[PDB]
Design a protein around this ligand. Structure first.
Ligand code: ZN
Length: 223
């Protein structure tokens, strides 16, 4: 379980997307180090220019790499579901705009962790901040609130992402999340806690394809 995360783990990410009928595919690679709670990844849109801004996809595009400090180990659901993995599902409500629905499988393939995601988005406004590409290329820090869902032998989470808009306003995205283990056996159901997240988005200046370089630090807290 946790024993699979004592060192650096290579990551492959795939996202098959469809927002208001605009189809796209994103592929990411890099590495995660759960001992420090660090993720370094590069994402490419293989279908050309995205119909939505990169920041809207960040939350979707491996919380198993969160640093859980020693006293909180017993509360790390994400690692305890490995290698078989977990399903992660979300509904994301963009305030005054459309919604994303996502379903992902996060599991080991041999020595590498893979996150495979399907995303469907509906009811977005033409000129809105999302389809109008009015969101800044950056990301804020958040708290991801996690609670046990004993019925499903898993967890739920709730949080609101704050996306900065070009005109100086903020676009809120309310996230509702569920995770359930894929394989049989026991998993760790946690007491209430949160993950504190920080993310930096950048560009590779030699990369001509549409892309996003990401560095994140996440540490669990609240117990
Ligand atoms: Zn693989």
């Amino acid at each position: 379980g946790e024993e699979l995360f004592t060192g650096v783990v290579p990551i492959l990410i795939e996202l098959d997307g469809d927002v208001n009928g605009h189809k796209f595919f994103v592929r990411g690679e890099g590495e995660g180090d759960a001992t420090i709670g660090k993720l370094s990844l590069k994402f490419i849109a293989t279908t050309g220019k995205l119909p939505v801004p990169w920041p809207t996809l960040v939350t979707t595009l491996v919380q198993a790499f969160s640093r859980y400090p020693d006293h909180m180990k017993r509360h790390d659901f994400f690692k305890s579901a490995m290698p078989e993995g977990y399903v992660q599902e979300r509904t994301i409500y963009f305030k005054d705009d459309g919604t994303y629905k996502t379903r992902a499988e996060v599991k080991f393939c041999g020595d590498h962790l893979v996150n495979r995601i399907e995303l469907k988005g509906i009811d977005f406004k033409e000129d809105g901040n999302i389809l109008g590409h009015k969101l800044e290329y950056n990301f804020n820090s958040h708290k991801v609130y996690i609670t046990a869902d004993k019925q499903n032998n898993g967890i739920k989470a709730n949080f609101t992402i704050r996306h900065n808009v070009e005109d100086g306003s903020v676009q809120l995205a309310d996230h509702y999340q569920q995770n359930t283990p894929i394989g049989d056996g026991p998993v760790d159901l946690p007491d209430d806690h949160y993950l504190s997240t920080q993310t930096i988005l950048s560009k590779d200046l030699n990369e001509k394809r549409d892309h996003m370089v990401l560095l994140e630090y996440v540490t669990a807290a609240g117990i």
